[PDB]
């Protein structure tokens, strides 16, 4: 499924942009959010892949 | 290559004109704009804030909002501008007296390490012909015949001129002054353009009216903005100035009056800014409906939710405030990039202290800096709608009293006094329009010191009369208890120490024989009947101490002395002074002559500097009433005993200010100046201090001049002895008088 590189590029670019906020100084959720939301989305995508197989 | 590149780099630049929206003066008070948006500038002498009850600033905001809500057309706008600045215009004064020169050198030495900065408020009420941006999107493209361009021209000029009249009438207690064209040397110099140029340049460059658009030639300083930062740099002839902007973006559940007062007391020279793009009632009601909808789409908070927005919307419909788009950009000026960042952090701490969370502007530094010039909405970073009451609470036109350093009728300000607030007051006799009956006049210059003596009243009056010699003014001093003898001798003028038992020394025997002089001498001998050269020196003195117990002799003595001084006033700077005025003035003869000759003298640079020890004893009589009401610059002093009636009824002093005066210490040096409506609890002080010279803290004390200026019959009775032994010259006998002072100072 080419949707696998597709999700790869989209999710990685989104993560890079979302973590660019700390440099951009527009987000006040440094520690709890950047681990929690990242782990939630990561677990969601991992479950999606391990289900797709 | 290495030759042609100058022109190649030259022609490829964006001039500052693209960012400055101004053009020809159309009216002497109103400036055009390339988009045809006429505006006017309002210099304001903000009324004092320290000396008022908390509820009364609420009342001031109420009156101010009430006047605004009448004229706040949907087409208006406001740019307040409190340009804190340091005083470079205060020339050092030449002198002749040695005692005065020493006193002034010591005094200016006492100012090493003091905030010498003066607030300067402003207001530019702008008028766009059209409000809605959507139709203006077309209007920027259409073509209009010149006659209808003229029609828009007079419509806008008349509308803005009505706005100016209304604001002037609404700023009666704010000392406002509309800035307008003034001519220098057969050429037109704009008064507003200097202020807007100060906004652009950072300096005060006198802007003439040449034959171009102002946008072309109104910037004489090449600005430079950092690629990634908040600070910039202005490359000028007189030196670089680095500026770091700042921005407000988070309000709170409050609009406490004058919450931005803390930036008045600043140690950093800056330029605050505001904007209030007044907004239509339907649009404002829609914004408030949006807030209501967002809030009500949630859990039912008990009171913040419901009733507050109930009353908000009900007021807005019932016409009690007018919403508008607002943005505030404090920009601190400094000399080095580290220092401007330090000042920026200080200003951020100050704003956070009053619960308005600021965030330094970083990406839109240039947009903000071009958003300060009035008539620039397209460059504002963060316009956020607020209640109008709230905007007038972000700019109540509060200000510490500072006075006018230069431009006075006589010239530079007479003295500079310490203020308990911290901001220095530039004292000067000539206040602005106390009588308030006619505009064309000579500024009223009287002064009335009142307060129980030994609290420095003689010290104060000696200090002013000692520093006022930069004007070379004539002085005639009617004193009491021989206090001023030492000073008047030190200022190198005749002092006559009138006393009983010794021959008078002056008599009318040799008077000129003209028919007017015959009239006077006939009048005198008709008043006496009851039951050398005077042109030599400049600063005279006469003692009338023994005449307080004399009913009969006061009229002849004052009659003769005043007549002799009357011929003196031919235009030269003349400064009558007095002491315990009413008893010399408690005479039925010359009250009418005094009022008439007062109106006459006030024209050719005349001044009365009154005084008093017991203000209760003075206000009772008829004569003192006109003179209390005819003094512009009050100077109140402290007293352990005070009465509401006299201070409020007679002296036009408010209740808060009266309680302030009562709260003063018994002998603490603190006197409430009251030039006009403005007030300031100043204090000239003569305490111990340190001097920054050669790394040496040279202990300097003012007592060597206190024992001269301070009134003491004992000290005067030995000063007279030492002058009798050696009466050569005050410049000569001053060291030996100080010597004999040191001889008695331990016996």
């Amino acid at each position: 499924a080419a949707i696998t590189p597709v999700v790869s590029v989209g999710l990685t670019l989104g993560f890079i942009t979302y973590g660019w906020l700390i440099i951009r100084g527009a987000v006040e959720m440094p520690v709890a959010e950047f681990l929690n939301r990242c782990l939630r989305i990561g677990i969601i995508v991992s479950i999606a892949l391990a289900g797709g197989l | 290559m290495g030759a042609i590149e100058s022109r190649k780099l030259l022609a490829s630049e964006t001039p500052v004109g693209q960012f400055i929206p101004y053009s020809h003066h159309v009216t002497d008070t109103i400036i055009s704009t390339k988009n045809a948006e006429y505006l006017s500038v309002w210099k304001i002498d903000g009324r004092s804030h320290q000396s008022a009850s908390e509820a009364d600033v609420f009342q001031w905001i109420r009156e101010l909002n009430n006047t605004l809500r009448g004229i706040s057309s949907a087409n208006l706008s406001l740019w307040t501008h409190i340009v804190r600045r340091r005083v470079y215009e205060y020339p050092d004064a030449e002198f002749d007296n040695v005692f005065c020169r020493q006193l002034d050198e010591k005094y200016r030495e006492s100012f090493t390490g003091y905030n010498l900065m003066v607030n300067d408020l402003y207001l530019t009420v702008v008028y766009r012909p059209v409000s809605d941006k959507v139709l203006s999107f077309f209007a920027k493209r259409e073509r209009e015949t010149p006659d209808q361009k003229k029609h828009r021209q007079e419509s806008c000029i008349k509308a803005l001129e009505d706005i100016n009249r209304t604001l002037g009438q609404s700023f009666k207690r704010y000392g406002a002054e509309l800035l307008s064209v003034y001519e220098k040397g057969g050429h037109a110099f704009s008064a507003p353009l200097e202020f807007l140029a100060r906004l652009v340049n950072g300096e005060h460059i006198p802007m003439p009216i040449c034959r171009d658009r102002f946008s072309d030639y109104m910037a004489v300083n090449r600005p430079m903005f950092s690629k990634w930062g908040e600070v910039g740099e202005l490359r000028s002839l007189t030196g670089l100035r680095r500026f770091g902007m700042l921005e407000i973006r988070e309000y709170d559940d409050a609009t406490e009056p004058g919450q931005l007062n803390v930036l008045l007391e600043s140690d950093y020279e800056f330029v605050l800014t505001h904007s209030f793009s007044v907004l239509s009632r339907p649009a404002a009601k829609e914004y408030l409906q949006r807030h209501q909808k967002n809030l009500i789409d949630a859990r039912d908070v008990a009171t913040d939710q419901i009733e507050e927005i109930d009353e908000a919307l009900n007021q807005l419909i019932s016409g009690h405030f007018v919403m508008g788009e607002h943005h505030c950009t404090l920009t601190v000026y400094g000399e080095t990039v580290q220092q401007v960042r330090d000042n920026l952090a200080h200003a951020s701490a100050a704003m956070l202290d009053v619960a308005v969370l600021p965030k330094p502007v970083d990406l839109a530094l240039e947009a903000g800096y071009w958003a300060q010039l009035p008539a620039n909405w397209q460059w504002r970073p963060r316009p956020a709608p607020i209640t109008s009451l709230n905007f007038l609470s972000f700019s109540p036109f509060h200000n510490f009293m500072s006075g006018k350093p230069t431009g006075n009728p006589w010239g530079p300000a007479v003295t500079i006094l310490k203020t308990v607030s911290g901001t220095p007051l530039y004292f000067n006799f000539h206040a602005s329009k106390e009588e308030e009956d006619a505009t064309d006049k000579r500024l009223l210059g009287n002064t009335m010191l009142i307060g129980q003596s030994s609290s420095g009243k003689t010290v104060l009056l000696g200090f002013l009369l000692a520093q006022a010699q930069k004007f070379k003014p004539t002085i005639v001093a009617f004193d009491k208890d021989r206090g001023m003898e030492i000073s008047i001798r030190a200022m190198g003028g005749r002092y006559l120490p009138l006393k009983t038992g010794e021959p008078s020394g002056f008599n009318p025997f040799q008077l000129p024989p003209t028919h007017a002089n015959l009239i006077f001498l006939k009048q005198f001998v008709k008043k006496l009947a009851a039951a050398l050269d005077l042109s030599t020196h400049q600063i005279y003195g006469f003692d009338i101490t023994e005449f307080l117990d004399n009913p009969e002799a006061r009229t002849p003595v004052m009659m003769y002395l005043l007549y002799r001084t009357e011929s003196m006033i031919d235009g030269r700077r003349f400064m009558y002074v007095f002491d315990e005025f009413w008893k010399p003035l408690q005479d039925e003869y010359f009250e009418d002559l005094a009022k008439n000759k007062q109106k006459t003298i006030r024209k050719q640079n005349g001044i009365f500097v009154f005084a008093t020890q017991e203000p209760s004893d003075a206000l009772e009589s008829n004569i003192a009433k006109t003179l209390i009401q005819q003094c512009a610059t009050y100077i109140f002093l402290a007293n352990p005993k005070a009465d509401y009636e006299d201070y409020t009824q007679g002296f036009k002093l408010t209740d808060s200010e009266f309680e302030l005066v009562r709260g003063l210490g018994e002998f603490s040096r603190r006197f409430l100046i009251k030039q006009g409506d403005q007030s300031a609890l100043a204090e000239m002080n003569l305490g111990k201090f340190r001097t920054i010279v050669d790394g040496e803290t040279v202990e300097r004390d003012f007592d060597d001049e206190l024992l001269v200026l301070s009134g003491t019959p004992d000290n005067a009775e030995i000063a007279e002895s030492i002058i009798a032994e050696v009466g050569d010259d005050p410049a000569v006998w001053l060291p030996i008088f100080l010597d004999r002072v040191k001889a008695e100072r331990s016996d």
């Binding site: 499924a1 080419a2 696998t4 590189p5 790869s8 990685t12 993560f15 973590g19 700390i22 440099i23 990242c38 990561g42 995508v45 991992s46 892949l49 197989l53 | 430079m224 950092s226 690629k227 990634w228 930062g229 600070v231 910039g232 740099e233 490359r235 670089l240 990039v337």
Partner: protein
Amino acid sequence: QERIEGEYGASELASERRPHTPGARTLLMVLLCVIAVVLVTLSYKAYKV
């Protein structure tokens, strides 16, 4: 042929630098390490399928 002494040259503002919060680099690197191992295993299955 050298810049002329005691004049205003280029700005002193170009010296400015954007400070880095001294935790962003290390944890950003470790986060990319883990996300990259996930993504490589994912493309391992992508090609294998």
